[PDB]
Design an enzyme around this catalytic site. Structure first.
Site, mmCIF file in Angstrom:
data_model
loop_
_atom_site.group_PDB
_atom_site.id
_atom_site.type_symbol
_atom_site.label_atom_id
_atom_site.label_comp_id
_atom_site.label_asym_id
_atom_site.label_seq_id
_atom_site.Cartn_x
_atom_site.Cartn_y
_atom_site.Cartn_z
ATOM 1 N N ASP A 276 -2.874 5.459 -5.091
ATOM 2 C CA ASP A 276 -3.136 4.603 -3.807
ATOM 3 C C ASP A 276 -3.111 2.390 -4.338
ATOM 4 O O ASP A 276 -3.857 2.445 -4.646
ATOM 5 C CB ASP A 276 -4.256 5.230 -3.118
ATOM 6 C CG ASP A 276 -4.820 3.793 -1.489
ATOM 7 O OD1 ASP A 276 -4.413 2.943 -1.418
ATOM 8 O OD2 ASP A 276 -5.176 4.291 -0.917
ATOM 9 N N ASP B 106 0.840 -1.043 -0.021
ATOM 10 C CA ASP B 106 0.116 -0.204 0.110
ATOM 11 C C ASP B 106 1.052 1.395 -0.631
ATOM 12 O O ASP B 106 1.438 1.821 0.779
ATOM 13 C CB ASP B 106 -0.845 -0.322 1.267
ATOM 14 C CG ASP B 106 -1.454 1.157 1.726
ATOM 15 O OD1 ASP B 106 -2.529 1.783 0.230
ATOM 16 O OD2 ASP B 106 -2.265 1.008 2.910
HETATM 17 C C1 LIG Z 1 -6.484 -2.845 1.045
HETATM 18 C C2 LIG Z 1 -6.372 -1.609 2.829
HETATM 19 C C3 LIG Z 1 -4.895 -1.211 2.795
HETATM 20 F F1 LIG Z 1 -3.906 -1.807 1.985
HETATM 21 C C4 LIG Z 1 -4.352 -0.452 3.843
HETATM 22 C C5 LIG Z 1 -5.576 -0.742 5.157
HETATM 23 C C6 LIG Z 1 -6.931 -0.966 4.956
HETATM 24 C C7 LIG Z 1 -7.279 -1.314 3.529
HETATM 25 C C8 LIG Z 1 -8.802 -1.564 3.060
HETATM 26 C C9 LIG Z 1 -9.044 -0.555 1.874
HETATM 27 C C10 LIG Z 1 -9.563 0.276 1.758
HETATM 28 C C11 LIG Z 1 -8.674 2.084 2.670
HETATM 29 O O1 LIG Z 1 -8.951 1.670 3.854
HETATM 30 N N1 LIG Z 1 -8.100 2.133 2.023
HETATM 31 C C12 LIG Z 1 -6.644 3.586 2.861
HETATM 32 C C13 LIG Z 1 -5.113 3.504 2.856
HETATM 33 N N2 LIG Z 1 -4.786 2.837 1.280
HETATM 34 C C14 LIG Z 1 -5.218 1.366 0.680
HETATM 35 C C15 LIG Z 1 -7.182 1.154 0.749
HETATM 36 C C16 LIG Z 1 -9.979 0.860 0.416
HETATM 37 C C17 LIG Z 1 -10.328 2.172 -0.102
HETATM 38 C C18 LIG Z 1 -9.749 3.212 0.404
HETATM 39 C C19 LIG Z 1 -10.853 1.637 -1.639
HETATM 40 O O2 LIG Z 1 -11.564 2.682 -1.534
HETATM 41 C C20 LIG Z 1 -11.632 0.196 -1.435
HETATM 42 C C21 LIG Z 1 -11.145 -0.234 -0.654
HETATM 43 C C22 LIG Z 1 -10.539 -0.395 0.456
HETATM 44 N N3 LIG Z 1 -9.572 -1.256 1.052
HETATM 45 C C23 LIG Z 1 -10.566 -2.294 1.310
HETATM 46 C C24 LIG Z 1 -10.348 -3.652 0.342
HETATM 47 C C25 LIG Z 1 -10.961 -4.699 -0.183
HETATM 48 C C26 LIG Z 1 -11.554 -5.146 1.130
HETATM 49 C C27 LIG Z 1 -12.150 -4.936 2.126
HETATM 50 C C28 LIG Z 1 -11.181 -3.297 2.151
#
Ligand SMILES: Cc1c(F)cccc1Cc1c(C(=O)N2CCNCC2)c2c(C)c(O)ccc2n1-c1ccccc1
Ligand SMILES: *[C@@H]1O[C@H](CO)[C@@H](O)[C@H](O)[C@H]1NC(C)=O
EC number: 3.4.23.15
Length: 337
Positions: free
Chosen positions: A223, A35
Site C-alpha cells: 500500500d 494509492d
Molecule cells: C492516505 C489515504 C489514501 F491514500 C486513501 C484513503 C485514505 C487515506 C488516509 C490514510 C490511510 C488509509 O486509510 N489508507 C487505506 C487505503 N490505502 C491508503 C492508506 C492510512 C493508513 C492505512 C495508515 O497505516 C497510516 C496513515 C493513513 N492515512 C493517512 C495518512 C496521512 C494523513 C491522514 C491519514
C-alpha cells in the site's frame, strides 16, 4: 505503446507523498495520493457543506467551471481503514503527467475532519484493480492501458528519505516503466496470490535473530498510500513488546537514546529477506533520554476479504523501489537510491 510518463511527488514529513492532477477544462489542480490500497478516484466537491471543516481547507472541484464535465450523480460511499468519505459520481478529463484520460471519479460531499484535516493532499487516485473499485467504476490505470500509449503495462514508485531539503525530490511515479536512476541491482518479483488486490504471500517476520511472527505464512498488502508498515493489533502488540516500545493512543514510542540500539526487522518475501534497520523505522528526531521517538510502524485491523493483513507502506517503499506489474500480476522490489 512507446511512452513513459513520470509524476513528481512532494514528500511531507515522510508520511504523505503527493503529486498533481488536473481535472476539467480549463484544468482545476489537486494534490493527490497515488494509492495501490484502493481503486477509486475522488476529490472534494464544491457541493460539500462548509460545516465539514476539511472542505473549507481543501481545494474543491467545481463542475460549473468545466466545459468537459459529464454529469452522472450516482451516490458512493468509500470506507477506508482511517475514515470514510461520501459523494456522487462525475465524469471529466483528468491529466496525469502528460497523459489525458476521460475518467469517472467521486465528487466528495461528506469529508470528516478526522483524518482529512491532517491530509496535505486534497484527493486520492486509486491504483488498485476494478475488483476493489466501489461502484464497479473503471480505475484510472485501466483507462490509461486502454489508450495503448505505455511501453509496459507497469507503474513504479520511488519515495525519498529526505523531507527537510529542497532540490532533493520527494518521490516519483513512473507510468509505463521504472527509473534506473532510483534503484540498484535487479528486481526480485513476487507473484500476487490472486488478481484484484496488490497483495502477496509473506513467510515470516524476524525481530533480530528469531522469527517471532508470521511463521506458517500470512499476507502482505503493498500500500503506497499507507504512511507506515502496519500489522494486526495482536501481531503489533507482540512485535512492539519484542522491541520494547510503549503503546500510546495512536502511535508507538521508544526512548530516543534507545533508538539506534533497536534490532533489525526482516520480512520474508518470495524466498528473499527484506531487512529494515532501526534507522529505517524509527523517526530519530533526537538522542535524548528525556525525549520520546516515534516508530514508522503501527496497528491496523484490515477487515475481510482483504484482511487480516500486514501493509507495507511508505516506510518499506523508501528502502525498496517498487514496481507494480499489471501484465504478469506481480510486484518487483529493488534497493532504492
Ligand atoms: C492516505 C489515504 C489514501 F491514500 C486513501 C484513503 C485514505 C487515506 C488516509 C490514510 C490511510 C488509509 O486509510 N489508507 C487505506 C487505503 N490505502 C491508503 C492508506 C492510512 C493508513 C492505512 C495508515 O497505516 C497510516 C496513515 C493513513 N492515512 C493517512 C495518512 C496521512 C494523513 C491522514 C491519514
Ligand atoms: C452513471 O454511469 C454508469 C456507467 O457504468 C451508468 O450505467 C449509469 O446509468 C449512469 N447514471 C446516469 C444518471 O448517467
Amino acid at each position: 505503446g512507446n511512452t513513459t510518463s513520470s509524476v513528481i511527488l512532494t514528500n511531507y514529513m515522510d508520511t504523505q507523498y503527493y503529486g498533481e492532477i488536473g481535472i476539467g477544462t480549463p484544468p482545476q489542480t489537486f494534490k493527490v495520493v497515488f494509492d495501490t490500497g484502493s481503486s477509486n478516484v475522488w476529490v472534494p466537491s464544491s457541493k460539500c457543506s462548509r460545516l465539514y471543516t476539511a472542505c473549507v481547507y481543501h481545494k474543491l472541484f467545481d463542475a460549473s467551471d468545466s466545459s468537459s464535465y459529464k454529469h452522472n450523480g450516482t451516490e458512493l460511499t468509500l470506507r477506508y481503514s482511517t475514515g470514510t468519505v461520501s459523494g456522487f459520481l462525475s465524469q471529466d478529463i483528468i491529466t496525469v503527467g502528460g497523459i489525458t484520460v476521460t475518467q469517472m471519479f467521486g465528487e466528495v460531499t461528506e469529508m470528516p475532519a478526522l483524518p482529512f484535516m491532517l491530509a496535505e493532499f486534497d484527493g486520492v487516485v486509486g491504483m488498485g484493480f476494478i475488483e476493489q473499485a466501489i461502484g464497479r467504476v473503471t480505475p484510472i490505470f485501466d483507462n490509461i492501458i486502454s489508450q495503448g500509449v505505455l511501453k509496459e503495462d507497469v507503474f513504479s514508485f520511488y519515495y525519498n528519505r529526505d523531507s527537510e531539503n529542497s532540490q532533493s525530490l520527494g518521490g516519483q511515479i513512473v507510468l509505463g516503466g521504472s527509473d534506473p536512476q532510483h534503484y540498484e541491482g535487479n528486481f526480485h518479483y513476487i507473484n500476487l496470490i490472486k488478481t484484484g488486490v496488490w497483495q502477496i504471500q509473506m513467510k515470516g517476520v524476524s525481530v533480530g535473530s528469531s522469527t517471532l511472527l508470521c511463521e506458517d505464512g500470512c499476507l502482505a498488502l503493498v500500500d503506497t498510500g499507507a504512511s507506515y508498515i502496519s500489522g494486526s493489533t495482536s501481531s503489533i502488540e507482540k512485535l512492539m513488546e519484542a522491541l520494547g516500545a510503549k503503546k500510546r493512543l495512536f502511535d508507538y514510542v521508544v526512548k530516543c537514546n534507545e533508538g539506534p540500539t533497536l534490532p533489525d526487522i526482516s520480512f520474508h518475501l518470495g524466498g528473499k529477506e527484506y531487512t529494515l534497520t532501526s534507522a529505517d523505522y524509527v523517526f530519530q528526531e533526537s538522542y535524548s533520554s528525556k525525549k520520546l521517538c516515534t516508530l514508522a510502524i503501527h496497528a491496523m485491523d484490515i477487515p475481510p476479504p482483504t484482511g487480516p493483513t500486514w501493509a507495507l507502506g511508505a516506510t518499506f517503499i523508501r528502502k525498496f523501489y517498487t514496481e507494480f506489474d499489471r501484465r504478469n500480476n506481480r510486484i518487483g522490489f529493488a534497493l532504492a537510491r
